[PDB]
Design a protein around this nucleic acid. Structure first.
Length: 101
DNA sequence: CTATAAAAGGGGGTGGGGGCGCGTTCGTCCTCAGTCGCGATCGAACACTCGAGCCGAGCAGACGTGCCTACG
């Protein structure tokens, strides 16, 4: 669920930045060095298992719809987020958060 | 202990008042036509002169009538 999105968006940004670099004048081997060392760093971080491998706190970043406060109680309407928990990573697109302050 | 409510303090915004600067209007300046005083000449009248002409007086005389004497 995570490497599928990572492969799709890394090939998306590669096939978009091809014209960006060749309109800024550099060799295609420089583009290849970008993608190659970028997957080297995904090897180095050692959190998700994928392709180039076979060849600090818990932060959740996201977006919100509404944060509601009924006096003590908080209600979070979070959406489109990438969680990093227990070392590993997960994705979500919706989250309801009940919070006692 | 944590949450909610109420109270107090601080900050911001709006309104009012005061001060300063722009604006207005009449008292004070600025010509300019109509008229006064004086020389300046001009026309009308007035005083003086001078001669032309007429009139009266005056005087010498003539042209007559009457009135009176030496000669035939």
């Amino acid at each position: 669920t995570v490497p599928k999105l990572y492969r799709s968006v890394i090939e998306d940004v590669i096939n978009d930045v091809r014209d960006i670099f060749l309109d800024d004048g550099v060799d295609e081997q420089v583009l290849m060095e970008l993608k190659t060392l970028w997957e080297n760093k995904l090897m180095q971080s050692r959190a998700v298992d994928g392709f180039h491998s076979e060849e600090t706190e818990n932060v959740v970043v996201c977006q919100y719809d509404k944060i509601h406060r009924s006096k003590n109680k908080w209600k979070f309407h979070l959406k489109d987020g990438i969680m990093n928990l227990n070392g590993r990573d997960y994705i979500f697109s919706k989250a309801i958060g009940d919070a006692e302050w």
